[PDB]
Amino acid sequence: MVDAFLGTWKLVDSKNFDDYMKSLGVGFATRQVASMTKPTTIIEKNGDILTLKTHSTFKNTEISFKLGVEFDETTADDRKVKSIVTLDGGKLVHLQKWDGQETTLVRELIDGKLILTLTHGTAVCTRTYEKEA
């Protein structure tokens, strides 16, 4: 039951993204630009294959995956990670692993908004997306 996630979403609120980027080792100049960007996230499905696009004026990313199947991913900050996306309690949980480190990207629907929670180390960032029609 991934169907409620599908569509086009626009960032409307961000808390502590600088704290998350610093924890990942992102350089101050990239943090500047990223702090002022309002990405568009598009989530599409074709059968068992999900595609997640993140578009912005700064960086674009795209991944395609099947739920529960590991994949190789190159992140926006140029980390080469082993990724798995699963559905857990109605949340879309994206785990990235590299160099014995982990970060989670959890997406949940609350009151029709998409809440993305990013955790690395002690850093927790919350990003709120709203559906575009």
Cβ partners under 8 Å of residue 46, min gap 6:
none
Minimum distance of ligand DKA from residue 50's CB (angstroms): 15
Angstrom distance (rounded) from CA 2 to CA 108: 11
| Nearest residue relative to ligand DKA (C-beta) | 76
CB of 52 closer than 8 Å to CB of 41? yes
Cβ partners under 8 Å of residue 20, min gap 6:
118, 120, 123, 124, 125
Angstrom distance (rounded) from CA 30 to CA 22: 10
Residues that bind ligand DKA (CB under 6 A): 21, 26, 30, 34, 39, 41, 54, 75-77, 116, 127
Of 34 and 50, which has the nearer Cβ to ligand DKA?
Answer: 34
Q: Determine whether the annotation assigns residue 128 to a binding site.
A: yes
Minimum distance of ligand DKA from residue 40's CB (angstroms): 10
Q: Determine whether the annotation assigns residue 20 to a binding site.
A: no
Minimum distance of ligand DKA from residue 21's CB (angstroms): 5
Q: What angle do CA 102, 110, 26 make, to 5 degrees?
A: 30
Of 41 and 47, which has the nearer Cβ to ligand DKA?
Answer: 41
Please state whether beta strands 40-46 and 7-15 pair in parallel, antiparallel, or not at all (unpaired): antiparallel
Of 16 and 75, which has the nearer Cβ to ligand DKA?
Answer: 75
Of 76 and 106, which has the nearer Cβ to ligand DKA?
Answer: 76
Residues tagged in the binding site annotation: 127-129
Numbered residues of the known binding site for octadecanoate: 127-129
